[PDB]
Short mmCIF file of C-alpha atoms in Angstrom, two decimals:
data_model
loop_
_atom_site.label_atom_id
_atom_site.label_comp_id
_atom_site.label_asym_id
_atom_site.label_seq_id
_atom_site.Cartn_x
_atom_site.Cartn_y
_atom_site.Cartn_z
CA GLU A 16 10.45 -77.82 74.92
CA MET A 17 10.76 -74.28 73.60
CA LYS A 18 12.83 -75.31 70.72
CA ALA A 19 15.56 -73.25 72.27
CA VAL A 20 19.29 -73.71 71.79
CA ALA A 21 20.92 -72.13 74.88
CA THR A 22 20.17 -70.83 78.27
CA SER A 23 21.62 -68.11 80.18
CA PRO A 24 23.68 -69.13 83.27
CA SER A 25 20.93 -67.75 85.53
CA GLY A 26 18.50 -69.87 83.62
CA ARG A 27 16.24 -66.90 83.13
CA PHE A 28 16.75 -66.27 79.39
CA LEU A 29 16.39 -68.67 76.51
CA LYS A 30 18.11 -68.24 72.99
CA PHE A 31 16.30 -69.21 69.80
CA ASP A 32 18.19 -70.17 66.58
CA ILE A 33 16.41 -67.33 64.77
CA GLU A 34 18.56 -64.38 63.61
CA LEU A 35 16.98 -61.11 63.95
CA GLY A 36 20.13 -58.82 62.84
CA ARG A 37 23.68 -58.55 62.06
CA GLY A 38 25.97 -55.84 62.75
CA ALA A 39 29.74 -55.30 62.76
CA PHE A 40 31.01 -58.00 65.29
CA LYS A 41 27.68 -58.76 66.59
CA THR A 42 24.71 -61.16 65.70
CA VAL A 43 21.10 -60.53 67.41
CA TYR A 44 19.18 -63.65 67.95
CA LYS A 45 15.43 -63.76 69.41
CA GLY A 46 15.44 -64.73 73.09
CA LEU A 47 12.91 -65.20 75.78
CA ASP A 48 12.64 -64.19 79.30
CA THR A 49 11.12 -67.42 81.10
CA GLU A 50 9.74 -65.32 83.94
CA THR A 51 7.46 -63.06 81.91
CA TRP A 52 7.26 -64.67 78.62
CA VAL A 53 8.52 -61.36 77.09
CA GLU A 54 10.59 -61.66 73.91
CA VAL A 55 13.95 -60.28 74.14
CA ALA A 56 17.14 -59.62 71.97
CA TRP A 57 20.05 -61.94 72.62
CA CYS A 58 23.14 -60.21 71.31
CA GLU A 59 26.43 -62.13 70.71
CA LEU A 60 29.15 -59.71 70.77
CA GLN A 61 32.64 -61.02 69.23
CA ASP A 62 35.41 -61.26 71.96
CA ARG A 63 37.42 -58.33 71.55
CA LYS A 64 40.51 -59.99 73.46
CA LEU A 65 39.57 -57.92 76.66
CA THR A 66 42.02 -57.97 79.59
CA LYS A 67 41.07 -58.81 83.26
CA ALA A 68 40.92 -54.94 84.17
CA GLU A 69 38.75 -54.11 81.18
CA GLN A 70 36.43 -57.15 82.00
CA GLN A 71 36.17 -55.84 85.60
CA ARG A 72 35.17 -52.25 84.26
CA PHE A 73 32.34 -53.54 82.08
CA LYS A 74 31.03 -55.54 84.91
CA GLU A 75 30.36 -52.63 87.04
CA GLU A 76 28.96 -50.74 84.19
CA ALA A 77 26.77 -53.58 83.39
CA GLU A 78 25.36 -53.65 86.97
CA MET A 79 24.58 -49.94 86.75
CA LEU A 80 22.67 -50.35 83.35
CA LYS A 81 20.47 -53.09 84.64
CA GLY A 82 18.90 -50.29 87.03
CA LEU A 83 18.13 -47.83 84.36
CA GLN A 84 14.45 -47.59 83.68
CA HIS A 85 13.07 -45.03 81.25
CA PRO A 86 10.87 -45.35 78.10
CA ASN A 87 13.33 -43.91 75.76
CA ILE A 88 16.28 -46.08 76.98
CA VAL A 89 16.70 -49.74 75.67
CA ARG A 90 16.27 -51.81 78.65
CA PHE A 91 19.52 -53.92 79.54
CA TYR A 92 18.72 -57.31 81.16
CA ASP A 93 21.93 -59.03 81.71
CA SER A 94 25.29 -59.95 80.19
CA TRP A 95 27.99 -62.58 80.50
CA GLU A 96 30.98 -64.25 78.81
CA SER A 97 30.22 -67.42 76.72
CA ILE A 98 32.21 -70.11 75.11
CA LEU A 99 29.41 -72.71 74.01
CA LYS A 100 30.35 -74.90 71.17
CA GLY A 101 33.74 -73.28 71.11
CA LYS A 102 32.61 -69.69 69.99
CA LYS A 103 34.05 -67.25 72.49
CA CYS A 104 31.64 -64.13 72.75
CA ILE A 105 29.87 -61.73 75.21
CA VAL A 106 26.22 -61.93 75.36
CA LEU A 107 23.91 -59.09 76.11
CA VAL A 108 20.24 -59.67 76.82
CA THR A 109 18.31 -56.33 76.02
CA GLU A 110 15.01 -55.24 75.34
CA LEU A 111 13.76 -56.25 71.78
CA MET A 112 13.26 -53.14 69.39
CA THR A 113 11.57 -54.90 66.27
CA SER A 114 12.37 -52.44 63.60
CA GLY A 115 15.95 -52.19 64.48
CA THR A 116 17.83 -48.77 64.16
CA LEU A 117 16.46 -45.35 62.95
CA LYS A 118 19.01 -45.66 60.22
CA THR A 119 17.57 -48.94 59.01
CA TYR A 120 14.02 -47.47 59.51
CA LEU A 121 14.79 -44.40 57.45
CA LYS A 122 16.05 -46.62 54.46
CA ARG A 123 12.25 -47.24 53.81
CA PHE A 124 11.43 -43.53 53.19
CA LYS A 125 12.27 -40.89 50.79
CA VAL A 126 11.79 -37.56 52.51
CA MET A 127 11.25 -36.86 56.27
CA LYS A 128 8.01 -35.59 57.44
CA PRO A 129 8.05 -32.93 60.23
CA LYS A 130 5.63 -34.50 62.51
CA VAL A 131 7.87 -37.77 62.37
CA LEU A 132 11.00 -35.61 63.09
CA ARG A 133 9.32 -33.88 66.21
CA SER A 134 8.25 -37.19 67.74
CA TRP A 135 11.35 -39.13 67.17
CA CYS A 136 13.80 -36.23 68.22
CA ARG A 137 11.56 -35.41 71.19
CA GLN A 138 12.06 -38.97 72.54
CA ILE A 139 15.53 -39.11 72.00
CA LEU A 140 16.02 -35.70 73.84
CA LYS A 141 14.05 -37.34 76.75
CA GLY A 142 16.30 -40.33 76.89
CA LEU A 143 19.39 -38.00 77.09
CA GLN A 144 17.95 -35.86 79.84
CA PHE A 145 17.27 -38.94 81.61
CA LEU A 146 20.91 -40.23 81.16
CA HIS A 147 22.36 -36.60 82.09
CA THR A 148 20.43 -36.69 85.37
CA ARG A 149 21.59 -39.68 86.72
CA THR A 150 24.02 -39.93 89.75
CA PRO A 151 26.69 -39.56 88.50
CA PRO A 152 25.59 -38.25 84.96
CA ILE A 153 25.70 -40.72 82.05
CA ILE A 154 27.18 -39.41 78.80
CA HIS A 155 26.33 -41.62 75.85
CA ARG A 156 29.42 -40.50 73.80
CA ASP A 157 28.55 -42.25 70.65
CA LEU A 158 25.15 -41.33 69.83
CA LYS A 159 24.18 -41.80 66.14
CA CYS A 160 21.25 -42.90 64.08
CA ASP A 161 22.59 -46.61 64.10
CA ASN A 162 22.10 -46.84 67.63
CA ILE A 163 18.85 -45.21 68.29
CA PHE A 164 16.28 -47.92 68.04
CA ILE A 165 12.39 -47.98 66.90
CA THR A 166 9.41 -50.24 67.24
CA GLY A 167 7.43 -49.78 64.18
CA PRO A 168 3.91 -50.58 65.61
CA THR A 169 4.18 -47.88 68.36
CA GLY A 170 6.59 -45.49 67.04
CA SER A 171 8.51 -45.82 70.37
CA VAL A 172 12.17 -44.59 69.99
CA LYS A 173 14.89 -45.64 72.35
CA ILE A 174 18.55 -45.06 72.93
CA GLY A 175 20.60 -48.22 72.87
CA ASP A 176 24.23 -49.32 72.94
CA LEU A 177 25.33 -47.57 76.17
CA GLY A 178 28.90 -48.51 76.91
CA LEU A 179 29.17 -50.31 73.71
CA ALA A 180 31.82 -48.40 71.92
CA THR A 181 34.09 -48.52 75.04
CA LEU A 182 33.45 -52.46 75.37
CA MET A 183 34.22 -52.80 71.60
CA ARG A 184 37.09 -50.17 71.16
CA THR A 185 39.86 -51.97 69.45
CA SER A 186 42.46 -49.34 69.63
CA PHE A 187 43.15 -45.82 71.15
CA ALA A 188 40.33 -43.52 69.35
CA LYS A 189 42.53 -40.77 67.98
CA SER A 190 46.19 -39.99 67.23
CA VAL A 191 48.01 -37.90 69.66
CA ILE A 192 51.29 -35.95 69.46
CA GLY A 193 54.16 -38.09 71.08
CA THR A 194 55.92 -41.48 71.18
CA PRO A 195 54.13 -44.06 73.09
CA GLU A 196 57.14 -45.29 75.15
CA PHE A 197 57.61 -41.82 76.47
CA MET A 198 54.00 -40.49 76.67
CA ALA A 199 52.55 -39.73 80.03
CA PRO A 200 49.29 -41.52 81.04
CA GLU A 201 47.22 -38.45 81.02
CA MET A 202 47.74 -37.91 77.57
CA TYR A 203 45.35 -40.63 76.78
CA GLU A 204 42.67 -39.19 78.67
CA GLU A 205 39.42 -37.99 77.09
CA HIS A 206 37.82 -34.53 78.06
CA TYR A 207 34.16 -34.17 77.48
CA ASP A 208 30.86 -33.56 79.08
CA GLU A 209 27.05 -33.70 78.32
CA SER A 210 27.58 -31.19 75.21
CA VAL A 211 29.18 -33.91 73.29
CA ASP A 212 25.70 -35.66 73.29
CA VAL A 213 24.14 -32.40 72.47
CA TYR A 214 26.49 -31.99 69.43
CA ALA A 215 25.82 -35.83 68.33
CA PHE A 216 22.03 -35.17 68.78
CA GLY A 217 22.13 -32.12 66.44
CA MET A 218 23.97 -34.20 63.66
CA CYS A 219 21.51 -36.93 63.99
CA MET A 220 18.66 -34.55 63.59
CA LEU A 221 20.44 -33.03 60.74
CA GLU A 222 20.76 -36.61 59.12
CA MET A 223 17.10 -37.40 59.88
CA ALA A 224 15.78 -34.13 58.34
CA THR A 225 18.00 -34.22 55.07
CA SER A 226 17.97 -38.16 54.57
CA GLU A 227 21.74 -38.04 54.09
CA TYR A 228 24.94 -38.50 55.96
CA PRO A 229 26.69 -35.35 57.27
CA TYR A 230 29.92 -34.46 55.51
CA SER A 231 29.43 -36.98 52.82
CA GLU A 232 31.10 -34.48 50.65
CA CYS A 233 34.27 -35.30 52.41
CA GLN A 234 36.18 -38.00 51.07
CA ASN A 235 38.04 -39.06 54.25
CA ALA A 236 37.82 -38.08 58.11
CA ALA A 237 40.98 -35.88 57.31
CA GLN A 238 38.72 -33.35 55.49
CA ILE A 239 36.03 -33.88 58.08
CA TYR A 240 38.46 -33.17 60.90
CA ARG A 241 39.72 -30.02 58.93
CA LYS A 242 36.02 -28.92 58.36
CA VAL A 243 34.82 -29.75 61.98
CA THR A 244 37.89 -28.24 63.73
CA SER A 245 37.68 -25.09 61.46
CA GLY A 246 34.02 -24.67 62.50
CA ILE A 247 32.65 -25.30 58.95
CA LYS A 248 29.34 -26.90 58.90
CA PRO A 249 28.32 -30.07 56.66
CA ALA A 250 27.04 -29.03 53.32
CA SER A 251 23.66 -30.98 54.04
CA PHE A 252 23.04 -28.15 56.67
CA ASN A 253 22.36 -25.77 53.82
CA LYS A 254 19.46 -28.12 52.90
CA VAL A 255 17.62 -27.31 56.29
CA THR A 256 15.12 -24.33 55.33
CA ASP A 257 12.52 -24.96 58.26
CA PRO A 258 13.69 -22.01 60.55
CA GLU A 259 13.01 -24.00 63.79
CA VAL A 260 14.90 -27.08 62.74
CA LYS A 261 17.80 -24.81 61.37
CA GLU A 262 17.75 -23.04 64.77
CA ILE A 263 17.75 -26.31 66.78
CA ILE A 264 20.67 -27.87 64.76
CA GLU A 265 22.56 -24.56 64.93
CA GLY A 266 22.36 -24.65 68.58
CA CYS A 267 23.62 -28.05 69.06
CA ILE A 268 26.64 -28.07 66.71
CA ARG A 269 28.24 -24.78 67.74
CA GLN A 270 31.97 -25.22 67.75
CA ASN A 271 32.33 -23.77 71.10
CA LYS A 272 30.77 -26.40 73.56
CA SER A 273 29.87 -23.68 76.10
CA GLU A 274 27.70 -22.08 73.51
CA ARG A 275 25.62 -25.05 72.89
CA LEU A 276 22.03 -25.39 74.16
CA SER A 277 21.38 -27.91 77.00
CA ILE A 278 19.18 -31.14 76.31
CA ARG A 279 16.46 -29.23 78.35
CA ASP A 280 16.82 -26.06 76.47
CA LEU A 281 16.26 -28.14 73.36
CA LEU A 282 13.20 -29.89 74.92
CA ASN A 283 11.90 -26.43 75.75
CA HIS A 284 11.82 -25.38 72.20
CA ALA A 285 8.31 -24.79 70.82
CA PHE A 286 9.04 -27.10 68.11
CA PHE A 287 8.94 -30.01 70.65
CA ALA A 288 5.91 -28.59 72.61
CA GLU A 289 3.35 -31.09 73.65
CA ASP A 290 0.71 -31.33 76.54
CA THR A 291 1.52 -30.99 80.17
CA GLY A 292 -1.96 -32.01 81.76
CA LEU A 293 -2.97 -28.13 81.61
CA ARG A 294 -6.17 -27.15 79.79
CA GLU B 13 82.71 -24.79 52.12
CA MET B 14 83.47 -24.58 48.54
CA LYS B 15 81.10 -24.80 45.71
CA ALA B 16 77.49 -24.11 46.81
CA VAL B 17 74.68 -25.93 45.19
CA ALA B 18 71.76 -23.98 46.57
CA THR B 19 70.83 -20.75 48.28
CA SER B 20 68.17 -19.77 50.63
CA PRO B 21 65.59 -17.36 49.12
CA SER B 22 66.79 -14.64 51.40
CA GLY B 23 70.40 -15.19 50.11
CA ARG B 24 71.71 -15.63 53.68
CA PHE B 25 72.44 -19.34 53.59
CA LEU B 26 74.33 -21.74 51.12
CA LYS B 27 73.81 -25.41 50.77
CA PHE B 28 76.74 -27.61 50.16
CA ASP B 29 76.51 -31.01 48.53
CA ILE B 30 77.71 -33.00 51.70
CA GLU B 31 74.97 -35.12 53.38
CA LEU B 32 75.77 -35.23 57.30
CA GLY B 33 72.90 -37.48 58.23
CA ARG B 34 69.25 -38.59 57.98
CA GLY B 35 66.83 -38.16 60.84
CA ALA B 36 63.05 -38.18 61.64
CA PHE B 37 61.39 -37.02 58.28
CA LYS B 38 64.68 -35.24 57.23
CA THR B 39 67.81 -35.35 55.18
CA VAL B 40 70.66 -33.00 56.71
CA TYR B 41 73.11 -31.36 54.58
CA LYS B 42 76.04 -28.93 55.46
CA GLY B 43 75.24 -25.30 54.99
CA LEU B 44 76.94 -22.03 55.63
CA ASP B 45 75.82 -18.70 57.03
CA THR B 46 77.23 -16.02 54.37
CA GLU B 47 76.94 -13.42 56.97
CA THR B 48 78.98 -15.03 59.84
CA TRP B 49 80.59 -17.90 58.01
CA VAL B 50 79.30 -20.25 60.73
CA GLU B 51 78.43 -23.76 59.34
CA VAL B 52 74.76 -24.67 59.83
CA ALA B 53 72.52 -27.56 59.17
CA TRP B 54 70.52 -27.37 55.98
CA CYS B 55 67.60 -29.90 56.61
CA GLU B 56 65.28 -31.02 53.63
CA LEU B 57 62.01 -32.46 54.78
CA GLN B 58 59.73 -34.95 53.39
CA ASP B 59 56.85 -33.53 51.18
CA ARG B 60 53.72 -33.05 53.05
CA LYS B 61 50.37 -31.79 51.62
CA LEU B 62 49.67 -28.78 53.91
CA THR B 63 46.55 -26.67 53.55
CA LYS B 64 46.82 -22.81 53.23
CA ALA B 65 45.84 -22.60 56.80
CA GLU B 66 48.28 -25.03 58.01
CA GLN B 67 50.90 -23.37 55.91
CA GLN B 68 50.19 -20.01 57.48
CA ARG B 69 50.31 -21.60 61.06
CA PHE B 70 53.86 -23.13 60.51
CA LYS B 71 55.12 -19.74 59.19
CA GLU B 72 53.80 -17.98 62.27
CA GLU B 73 55.39 -20.84 64.52
CA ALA B 74 58.68 -20.63 62.58
CA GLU B 75 59.01 -16.96 63.45
CA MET B 76 58.45 -17.74 67.10
CA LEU B 77 61.18 -20.28 66.76
CA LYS B 78 63.66 -17.78 65.69
CA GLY B 79 63.30 -15.90 68.86
CA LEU B 80 64.25 -19.15 70.99
CA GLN B 81 67.90 -18.45 71.94
CA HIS B 82 69.24 -20.62 74.61
CA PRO B 83 72.47 -22.85 74.92
CA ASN B 84 70.64 -26.03 75.15
CA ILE B 85 68.22 -25.47 72.33
CA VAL B 86 69.15 -26.08 68.73
CA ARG B 87 68.94 -22.66 67.12
CA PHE B 88 66.32 -22.10 64.44
CA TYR B 89 67.38 -19.90 61.62
CA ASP B 90 65.09 -19.83 58.57
CA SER B 91 62.42 -22.12 56.58
CA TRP B 92 60.78 -21.99 53.15
CA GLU B 93 59.41 -24.26 50.72
CA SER B 94 61.18 -25.65 47.63
CA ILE B 95 60.41 -27.83 44.92
CA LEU B 96 62.99 -30.86 45.40
CA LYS B 97 62.77 -33.80 42.84
CA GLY B 98 59.36 -32.58 41.52
CA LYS B 99 57.65 -32.34 45.05
CA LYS B 100 57.17 -29.33 47.23
CA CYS B 101 59.32 -29.77 50.38
CA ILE B 102 60.08 -27.57 53.46
CA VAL B 103 63.63 -26.79 54.02
CA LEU B 104 64.81 -25.58 57.44
CA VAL B 105 68.01 -24.09 58.54
CA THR B 106 69.09 -24.75 62.06
CA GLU B 107 72.32 -24.86 64.15
CA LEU B 108 74.45 -27.76 63.33
CA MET B 109 75.09 -30.46 65.99
CA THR B 110 77.94 -32.52 64.40
CA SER B 111 77.76 -35.68 66.50
CA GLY B 112 73.81 -36.31 65.66
CA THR B 113 71.33 -37.27 68.20
CA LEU B 114 72.02 -38.66 71.73
CA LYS B 115 70.55 -41.91 70.48
CA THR B 116 73.17 -42.09 67.56
CA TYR B 117 76.06 -41.09 70.07
CA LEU B 118 75.03 -43.69 72.40
CA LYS B 119 75.50 -46.54 69.93
CA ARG B 120 79.34 -45.81 70.15
CA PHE B 121 79.51 -46.85 73.86
CA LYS B 122 78.55 -49.65 75.87
CA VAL B 123 77.82 -48.65 79.45
CA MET B 124 76.74 -45.33 80.58
CA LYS B 125 79.19 -43.41 83.00
CA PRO B 126 77.34 -41.29 85.81
CA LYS B 127 79.29 -38.25 85.28
CA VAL B 128 78.10 -38.43 81.62
CA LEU B 129 74.51 -38.97 82.44
CA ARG B 130 74.61 -36.06 84.88
CA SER B 131 76.09 -33.71 82.22
CA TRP B 132 73.68 -34.64 79.59
CA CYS B 133 70.50 -34.62 81.74
CA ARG B 134 71.39 -31.23 83.42
CA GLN B 135 71.61 -29.90 79.89
CA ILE B 136 68.32 -31.24 78.91
CA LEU B 137 66.74 -29.93 82.22
CA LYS B 138 68.10 -26.36 81.53
CA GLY B 139 66.53 -26.53 78.03
CA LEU B 140 63.05 -27.45 79.30
CA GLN B 141 63.44 -24.93 81.98
CA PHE B 142 63.97 -22.45 79.21
CA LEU B 143 60.98 -23.62 77.20
CA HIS B 144 58.57 -23.83 79.99
CA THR B 145 59.26 -20.34 81.01
CA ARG B 146 58.62 -18.58 77.83
CA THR B 147 55.37 -16.58 77.37
CA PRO B 148 53.48 -18.61 76.69
CA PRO B 149 54.99 -21.80 77.99
CA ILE B 150 56.48 -24.19 75.29
CA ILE B 151 55.87 -27.80 75.86
CA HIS B 152 58.00 -30.13 73.80
CA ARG B 153 55.65 -33.05 73.84
CA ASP B 154 57.85 -35.32 71.96
CA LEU B 155 60.96 -35.48 74.09
CA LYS B 156 63.10 -38.39 73.52
CA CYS B 157 66.84 -39.44 72.83
CA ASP B 158 66.20 -39.19 69.08
CA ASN B 159 65.51 -35.41 69.20
CA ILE B 160 68.15 -34.44 71.51
CA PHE B 161 71.36 -33.55 69.86
CA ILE B 162 75.13 -33.38 70.83
CA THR B 163 78.36 -32.08 69.75
CA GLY B 164 81.10 -34.59 70.55
CA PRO B 165 84.11 -32.23 70.92
CA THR B 166 82.36 -30.02 73.44
CA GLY B 167 79.76 -32.41 75.16
CA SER B 168 77.03 -29.66 74.38
CA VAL B 169 73.73 -31.26 74.48
CA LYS B 170 70.67 -29.33 73.01
CA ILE B 171 66.91 -30.12 72.41
CA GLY B 172 65.82 -30.02 68.91
CA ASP B 173 63.04 -30.90 66.71
CA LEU B 174 60.41 -28.50 68.13
CA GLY B 175 57.18 -28.60 66.44
CA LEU B 176 58.32 -31.28 64.10
CA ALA B 177 55.96 -33.99 65.24
CA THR B 178 53.04 -31.79 64.78
CA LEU B 179 54.19 -30.41 61.43
CA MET B 180 54.89 -34.00 59.96
CA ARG B 181 51.77 -35.64 61.48
CA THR B 182 49.54 -37.86 59.20
CA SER B 183 46.92 -40.30 59.21
CA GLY B 184 33.29 -41.81 68.59
CA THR B 185 32.26 -41.47 64.99
CA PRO B 186 33.91 -38.66 62.88
CA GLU B 187 30.88 -37.10 61.40
CA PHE B 188 29.17 -36.85 64.85
CA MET B 189 32.34 -36.27 67.02
CA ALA B 190 32.48 -32.85 68.46
CA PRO B 191 35.42 -30.55 67.87
CA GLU B 192 36.63 -30.61 71.51
CA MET B 193 37.21 -34.37 71.10
CA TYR B 194 40.11 -33.48 68.91
CA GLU B 195 41.65 -31.37 71.64
CA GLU B 196 45.00 -32.75 73.26
CA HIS B 197 45.56 -32.11 76.93
CA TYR B 198 48.92 -31.91 78.41
CA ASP B 199 51.15 -29.49 80.72
CA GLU B 200 54.59 -29.27 81.60
CA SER B 201 54.56 -32.59 83.46
CA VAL B 202 54.39 -34.34 80.11
CA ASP B 203 57.92 -33.13 79.52
CA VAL B 204 59.15 -34.28 83.03
CA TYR B 205 57.68 -37.71 82.22
CA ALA B 206 59.55 -37.99 78.83
CA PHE B 207 62.77 -36.73 80.64
CA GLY B 208 62.48 -39.49 82.92
CA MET B 209 62.16 -42.15 80.17
CA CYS B 210 65.10 -40.37 78.46
CA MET B 211 67.24 -40.94 81.49
CA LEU B 212 65.98 -44.54 81.75
CA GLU B 213 67.02 -44.95 78.05
CA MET B 214 70.48 -43.52 78.62
CA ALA B 215 71.08 -45.46 81.92
CA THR B 216 69.99 -49.01 80.34
CA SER B 217 70.88 -48.51 76.61
CA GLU B 218 67.53 -49.59 75.40
CA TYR B 219 64.00 -48.17 74.71
CA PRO B 220 61.45 -48.21 77.67
CA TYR B 221 58.91 -50.84 77.44
CA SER B 222 61.02 -52.93 74.66
CA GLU B 223 59.20 -55.86 76.08
CA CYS B 224 55.84 -54.70 74.38
CA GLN B 225 55.23 -55.99 71.12
CA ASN B 226 53.13 -52.94 70.03
CA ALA B 227 51.63 -49.67 71.13
CA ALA B 228 48.38 -51.29 72.73
CA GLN B 229 50.46 -52.92 75.36
CA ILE B 230 52.29 -49.95 76.37
CA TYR B 231 49.05 -48.07 76.74
CA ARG B 232 47.84 -50.90 78.85
CA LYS B 233 50.81 -50.74 81.08
CA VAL B 234 51.17 -47.02 81.22
CA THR B 235 47.48 -46.58 82.13
CA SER B 236 47.90 -49.47 84.59
CA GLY B 237 50.70 -47.78 86.50
CA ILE B 238 53.31 -50.59 85.34
CA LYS B 239 56.73 -49.49 84.84
CA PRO B 240 59.10 -50.67 81.98
CA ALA B 241 61.02 -53.88 82.51
CA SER B 242 64.17 -51.66 82.11
CA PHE B 243 63.24 -49.79 85.30
CA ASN B 244 64.41 -52.66 87.28
CA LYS B 245 67.64 -53.06 85.56
CA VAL B 246 68.76 -49.65 86.80
CA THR B 247 71.98 -50.43 88.86
CA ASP B 248 72.55 -46.83 90.33
CA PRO B 249 69.89 -46.35 93.07
CA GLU B 250 70.05 -42.73 92.78
CA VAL B 251 69.31 -42.76 89.18
CA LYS B 252 66.61 -45.11 89.83
CA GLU B 253 64.96 -42.86 92.41
CA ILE B 254 65.15 -39.81 90.11
CA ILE B 255 63.53 -41.93 87.19
CA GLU B 256 60.76 -43.10 89.43
CA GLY B 257 59.85 -39.26 90.59
CA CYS B 258 59.43 -38.28 86.91
CA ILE B 259 57.30 -41.15 85.67
CA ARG B 260 54.79 -41.12 88.54
CA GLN B 261 51.34 -42.12 87.13
CA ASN B 262 49.78 -38.99 88.90
CA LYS B 263 51.24 -35.90 87.33
CA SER B 264 50.75 -33.77 90.29
CA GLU B 265 53.10 -35.94 92.22
CA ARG B 266 55.98 -35.72 89.76
CA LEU B 267 59.12 -33.65 90.37
CA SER B 268 59.26 -30.01 89.03
CA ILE B 269 61.84 -29.07 86.65
CA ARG B 270 63.24 -26.72 89.54
CA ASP B 271 63.07 -29.82 91.75
CA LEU B 272 65.26 -31.62 89.18
CA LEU B 273 67.58 -28.80 88.33
CA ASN B 274 68.58 -28.39 92.07
CA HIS B 275 68.77 -32.19 92.88
CA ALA B 276 72.19 -33.06 94.04
CA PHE B 277 72.61 -35.53 91.53
CA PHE B 278 72.62 -32.89 88.91
CA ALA B 279 74.94 -30.46 90.67
CA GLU B 280 77.26 -28.38 88.37
CA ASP B 281 80.74 -29.75 88.06
CA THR B 282 82.17 -26.54 89.38
CA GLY B 283 84.72 -28.74 91.65
#
């Protein structure tokens, strides 16, 4: 009756044949929560030939994401494996962010305004502080302007795509010294903590402030790797003259992770000051 | 040892126009130490584009390699850069292992003999024991039968190609990826693991996980704790038990190098 073309296994969500966006290996359709009449994003992720072990790991992660409620985290409703009409995919139902990503929204503007930067970055930081104070802490690990989302008519900014990079990871991320047949399993382990999100946040803030992609002077990741592992900042950093924004970004992208500010230290900066209910 | 065709910058080593073999990233020629008249390996490496930083690092690492003197480590003499057929290459002079790698030597034989396995593996362990007890410890990180070498007429077995994997290496989101994400984490037990796979390769005459079609399947099995198919083709139960003790998933459960050196299977042939 709704002009819907599909229903979730639970029956709770409808899919409409209305495409709202296209990213790499995913299509976002307009959906509807039949219980609340709230419009939602019905995201179809191309099957990445996942095994039975990986499918189990994401199912436990997906159940934990369902519980996250925070104003700066995109809400996660449900997920399942679909094979309708012979198309194999994973469906994710999430909160619908009508203006897409910050990367997409920023394409409409020439120069960043300081009041906008303050508002967007404060919201991102509040979402990260929420994630880092869960039990156990959640580390995003892949924060960028293309997975932070915005709703144009409110200016609400929310972090999205939690767990997506691990779910869609086609190969082992980076190359390691060794021969696979002889390499112990612990050589594939990844060592990181909350400060990887602090570093990513600083690069996001630099991108927003300068309206350009960091390290665009490098022709390939080999040069980036050599610059980054040498502690050389992106050239776009030289364009930041506002001393507060400069000191904020500097405190995030320090090479030594133990010297970076925490998310709460960043939220304490006078640049992000707001109102506390005290007058 | 007549008619040299090149000399090292120092004047110490001569190159003869005699190609002894090819290896990982290298062509090996017969050379000579003019000071001692000992024949050596003159190894010409494939050209690599190294920054001024990486070049300095290799120079400092090479100077440390000169100090590693042990009967089961291939001795490193000298290195430099040379223009070879128009391209800048690294030349290394090392001890000459006349029979090549264990992998090559094994191709001449059909079935591994236990006394041979015990002798080759005991020598690899003594080499690892030496490397791991340097100050600071040296972890090989790429131990395999293709960079362990042998001299046929003595049965002497020596670990080589130290640091060659890192020198010859080539190629989250990169622009947003914190520098610590590029760090590699490992300790001495990664060499114990590779030793176990080396022992498996010798005992069965095939690469471990040869049933896998590509690296991602190996990654899936190794992270899952699934052993190579060749592990169950090991006929000797004592060899099988040692291999299992080296390739345990939890590195803290693996045998130490001292455990392996003092295992009865590797007891010296004094009687």
